[PDB]
Amino acid sequence: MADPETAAKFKSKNAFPDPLNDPKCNPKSLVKKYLTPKVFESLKNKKTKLGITLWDCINSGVVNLDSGVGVYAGDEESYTLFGPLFDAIIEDYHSPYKLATGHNSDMNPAHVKAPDLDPANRYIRSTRIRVARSLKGYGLAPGVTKAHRLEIEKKVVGVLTSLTGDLAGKYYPLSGMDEKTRQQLVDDHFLFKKGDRFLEAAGINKEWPEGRGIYHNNDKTFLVWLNEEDHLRIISMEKGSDIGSVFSRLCRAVNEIDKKLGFQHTKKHGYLTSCPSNLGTGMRASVHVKIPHAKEHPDFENILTKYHIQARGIEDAGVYDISNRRRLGLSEVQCVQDMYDGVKALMELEKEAIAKKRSVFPEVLKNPEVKSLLRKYLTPELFDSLKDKKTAKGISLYDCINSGVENLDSSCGVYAGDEECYTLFAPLFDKIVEDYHSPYKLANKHTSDMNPEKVDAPNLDPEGTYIRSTRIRVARNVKGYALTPGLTRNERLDIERKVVGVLSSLTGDLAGQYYPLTGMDEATRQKLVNDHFLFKKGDRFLEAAGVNKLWPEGRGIFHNNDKTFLVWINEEDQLRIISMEKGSDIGSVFGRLCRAVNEIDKQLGFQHTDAHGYLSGCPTNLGTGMRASVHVKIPKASAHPDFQKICDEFHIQARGGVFDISNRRRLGLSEVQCVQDMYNGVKKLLEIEK
Ligand SMILES: NC(=[NH2+])NCCC[C@H](N)C(=O)O
């Protein structure tokens, strides 16, 4: 809706912008509201030291009649020299703030008291704090000279590239940027392009793109936009709820630039920005939180009003963007504290509602047509006796059974959040384990054996006539942490870091590289699809169990150069380790698998008990956590009346005229014994197709 032509005719005559009376103009426009003919004539001949006029400031609002505010400050002096205009605009926008009152700034993180609100990521999805800042000694963005914009870049980059620790990173200037860098920054949502029709008419687009640039730390949790709408747009953000950490990281960086360079700042306005809407703190603090039940709640609006925050909706059903509505009259510390307390109060509403509905027996389980293992063993008696206990990591019975409740068509419907779940909720888990893993009894206990030399497997089909492929997978979880459904944000990131650290140290047969899912370009994605190495987000069963939290943060893929060794990280289990080969050499596949699994084990360790073997969030993956597969062509021995008599002696099953043959048992036998059985069974099947 930009009409630059019409405005230019009024600007060149230094005449009152008549378009501000054209019915299409925004009724709520502040420049329309407060730029009266008497204001205009009183100021139309005034100019700042930098040459900024009244028309320069108001121009964007006349070009873009749909403007909410409609004015931009060319410099600091513009706020005072055109005071009769800016004051009325500021006190309208920032109501009930009064310029006479004064503003107080506070960038000391220690003043904020904010223990991590939602480490388990049950409700809060992401946290983001933005500040706008302008350097001492220069004009603001609409009025900065060509040389000054460059000098600002030079000084800012000098400070930013000296940043240490988690703030260390790289600067990417827009001028000279190549296509690969441009795409990387687009994929990370870090890029900004030429200003819209609002920045254009404000004169902010001058000399594009000279002096513009992007800085970001290696973690990609800190972002700086240089010379966009203001000199500095500084952003601290991350998934999860730790706003205390976010504000701490922001202030460490901001105060460093402050001490070395200095910001434009007054008592009246706080920190000076191009648009008056960004005065004071220059801050936008935001949190994304799934809060469906609290919205319905009668005290919802009162909490927002109390803490001066607002809620806007944006997969993300029930998810709201909570953010501050004030920038003047409160400090940065105060803005974050209201933000913290406000979210906390909102989260407590959502928690109360969920607690109430989780207080009673899942009535939906009373339907006789629900044939899940959950319904079979979860009597109201058992439910009542367990419903109020929680593990050391905050896992409850309802957390464990939630997927089976939400998904009535589950076969099992029960997941474990941590190791303690298998003991604390043993009345439920024991019966489910022994049912699915029948005839195994927990008292028998389980023996793990990852010694490949204890397997006697001379190659069956070296010709490659019958057995096309052989594949052995094991599911594993890293010791010292919760299981996948109960992982906190920092646990999942720790698991990725340490596992990646181990896999990179692998040599010989197992040397390879790691592809994280976060920030993966389309080229890598495609070539992983070709090899069938790429995994996607979990289904509705895993979603309801809490497995898909913060996707895809902390998820990644590793494979060796020979395409014979694959590791999925933080998918369904923390570690899904697969050995693959062409042909029939099971002993070679298992040997390679053992070499890698044993090394990861020594350096990191696995979650393991005598009664369950290796622990998984999914009770189906206990014991060996192993699926051994043989893709074999058997048209004839599939018919010999000794198929059952062999497929049952060696506990194997057949599907897939090529047939996939897999082990049926995971619990009660060792990995060695399981592999040996698959061998012994396929051998006799091959002693019939021979
Ligand atoms: N590969 C392993 N991490 N094995 C662990 C064996 C001991 C285990 N902590 C248990 O008592 O059951």
Residue type, 488: T
Place of tokens 């630039």: 257
Ligand 1 centre to CA of 477 (Å) is 11
CB atoms within 10 A of CB 642: 13
**Annotated binding-site residue? 36:** no
DSSP 75-135: SHHHHHHTHHHHHHHHHHHTTT--TTT-------GGG-----S-TT-SSEEEEEEEEEE-B
| Atom in ligand 1 nearest the alpha carbon of residue 606 | 3
| Atom in ligand 1 nearest the alpha carbon of residue 610 | 12
CATH node for 360-445: 1.10.135.10
Ligand 1 centre to CA of 385 (Å) is 31
Q: Which fold has domain 103-359?
A: Creatine Kinase; Chain A, domain 2 (3.30.590)
Nearest-CA residue for ligand 1 atom 6 is: 608
CATH node for 446-690: 3.30.590.10
Q: Rounded to whole angstroms, how far apart are CA atoms 544 and 241?
A: 20
Check: CB of residue 386 under 8 Å from CB of residue 397: yes
Q: Is there a shared CATH topology between the 103-359 domain and the 446-690 domain?
A: yes
Using alpha carbons, select from 261, 257, 282, 260 the residue that is nearest to residue 272. Answer: 282
Ligand 1 centre to CA of 609 (Å) is 6
**Annotated binding-site residue? 69:** yes
Class of domain 1-102 (CATH, top level): mainly alpha
Check: CB of residue 222 under 8 Å from CB of residue 248: no
Ligand 1 centre to CA of 479 (Å) is 9
Ligand 1 centre to CA of 606 (Å) is 7
Tokens of 521: 């370009």
Task: Identify any residues that bridge with 172 across adjacent strands, giving them in sequence order.
Answer: 214
Residue 410 Cα distances to 367, 490, 639, angstroms: 14, 30, 34
Q: Is 605 in the pocket of ligand 1 (CB under 6 A)?
A: yes
DSSP 245-266: HHHHHHHHHHHHHHHHH-B-EE
| Atom in ligand 1 nearest the alpha carbon of residue 605 | 3
Using alpha carbons, select from 60, 13, 2, 9 the residue that is nearest to residue 35. Answer: 60
Place of tokens 């809620």: 311
Check: CB of residue 662 under 8 Å from CB of residue 444: no
Tokens of 210: 């000279």
**Annotated binding-site residue? 611:** no
Q: Could you tell me the residue ranges of all domains in the chain?
A: 1-102, 103-359, 360-445, 446-690
Determination technique for this PDB entry? X-ray
Nearest-CA residue for ligand 1 atom 3 is: 606
Nearest-CA residue for ligand 1 atom 8 is: 608
Q: Is 610 in the pocket of ligand 1 (CB under 6 A)?
A: yes
Check the chain for breaks (C–N over 2.5 Å) and list the residue before each, or none: 314, 656
Residue 401 burial by Cβ neighbours in a 10 Å radius (0-12, 13-18, 19+): buried
Using alpha carbons, select from 584, 524, 593 the residue that is nearest to residue 564. Answer: 593
CB atoms within 10 A of CB 175: 13
Resolution given for this structure, in angstroms: 2.3
3-state secondary structure of 655: strand
Using alpha carbons, select from 669, 674, 625 the residue that is nearest to residue 475. Answer: 625
Ligand 1 centre to CA of 613 (Å) is 8
Nearest-CA residue for ligand 1 atom 7 is: 608
Tokens of 414: 């029960």
Tokens of 425: 């909720």
DSSP 306-356: HTTEEEEE---TTEEEEEE---SSS-HHHHHHHHHHHHHHHHHHHHHHHHH
Q: Rounded to whole angstroms, how far apart are CA atoms 674 and 665?
A: 8
The helix or strand, by DSSP H or E, that contains position 650, with its residue range, turns out to be: none
Q: Is 601 in the pocket of ligand 1 (CB under 6 A)?
A: yes
Pocket test for ligand 1, best of 478, 600, 608, 624 (most atoms within 8 A of CB): 608
Q: How far apart are the first and last CA of the chain?
A: 79
Residue 146 burial by Cβ neighbours in a 10 Å radius (0-12, 13-18, 19+): exposed
